Design a binder for these strands. Structure first.
Lengths: 92, 91, 87, 92, 91, 92
DNA sequence: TCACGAACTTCACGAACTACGCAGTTCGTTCTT
DNA sequence: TGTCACGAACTATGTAGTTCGTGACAATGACAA
């Protein structure tokens, strides 16, 4: 697929998502888009994949949808985070 | 539209490529491939993006082309890797 | 190879750029019948050598030919002439 | 296949092979190479393909072996040579 | 010139090719390779010799070609195998 | 290596020789040539290999040099001989 | 409203085939012995 | 003479890279009522 575009180079949008959620614990689709500057339609498409893959599960609180990580979607983030460490390790 | 990826949900193959050079110096498009597990085609395809941008250059020795970061490439790598540690300030 | 017994897909791509200047990839593939993938393949190469340059007009993209590319185009053309003139 | 490489920007190696044959009728493998400067191996690489499709035939004359274009060899030689002018429009 | 080799001491790669055609009538270039242990490279160069000598003829289908023995080729294939046993008549 | 050329479609020269010796046992270098369609230079070029491999050894009936199969040698024939038969079997 | 489906373009990368080196090998001439 | 060394031409095959297909994909300008 795309992946390596002039915008991303190093991190894929899905990394900006997961990470963001590791902070806000949960947030609305629109929030993510703006909060990471990634165009909305990139977010919604990627969240489907996340949902479908079981890394994210919705959480209706009011009438607004929310997206939170799952165990599997948390374990995942570690694998990629450590993988992401070994890279930024070389700079030193 | 659709999304799958196993090899890179977090990092782009381009990423894995930039760093491998920073960590080794010069390398044949072959070696790049083998040590990053990024299958050949992608390796060269991305390398050509890098050239066209000014982040790496060729080096014919005898019958073997070598690639290595440029200063512009060097600055970029460390620059982004920096912005990385930032977001990963929640580990 | 069949379609390319004499001329590379590069030729059809280069020349068609000499007589348009500005040009999208998707389009070139139409005006030369050279499969789209076979084309951006060469754009990626062209860009990598300075013979061509991208130019994302806002949201669209236009691949124009460069100074350096211009000369290469002319040069490799006489070669074709000294070759063909002898029939 | 390969075809288009840094050495062959516009012209295949077989262009030279073929042309130089219209320009000498029958030539031998070792020869086709020297007058053109393309690596001998690439030359037979093509010569074989030429025999297959039926654009050339060998001359088992005497000791050395010779190659010359054929009826359908010469025809498809000018065919391609002409529509090269079909391109050099930009050159005028 | 020196003679290393250890695969083609008795049999040229051409035999396994010619013979395999008798087993299927027609086959792709990768088909007969993987099914004769003879490198795909040497196959092409060989069918390209057979085509040139009319012992075989193509037949494009979709994204690949299939090669089939012809009639003048069948004579050859058949004849030789006879020439073979005439020699195998040492035991 | 050459191996397969117009003369050698199925069988190599290394076949017709090893066979000739499985017949008369001890043939003269020269004599192997005539008894086969093999040109002299091709024969000794293969002998020197056989010799260097221990598939063949020398011998003198007077002054001429006769060649003969050996321990390592015959096992080879009675090894390849099987491959050639396992092959043809299919089209028997 | 918000995610969704259609639409454009570029990306990932696998199959197959080519450009071309290397290491044989067929045989024909010098050359040694 | 017989064998070796040279020596001109092709075969075998591996390595890197090309064509061009398929399966994504990023960021749009509409459905979807």
């Amino acid at each position: 697929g795309k992946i390596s575009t002039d915008k991303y180079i190093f991190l894929t949008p899905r990394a900006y998502i997961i990470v963001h959620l590791l902070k806000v614990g949960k947030a609305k689709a629109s929030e993510i888009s703006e909060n990471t500057q990634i165009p909305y339609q990139t977010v919604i498409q990627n969240i489907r994949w996340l949902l479908a893959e079981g890394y994210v599960v919705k959480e209706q609180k009011g009438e607004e949808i929310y997206y939170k990580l799952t165990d599997k979607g948390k374990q995942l983030a570690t694998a990629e985070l450590e993988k992401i460490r070994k890279l930024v390790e070389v700079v030193q």
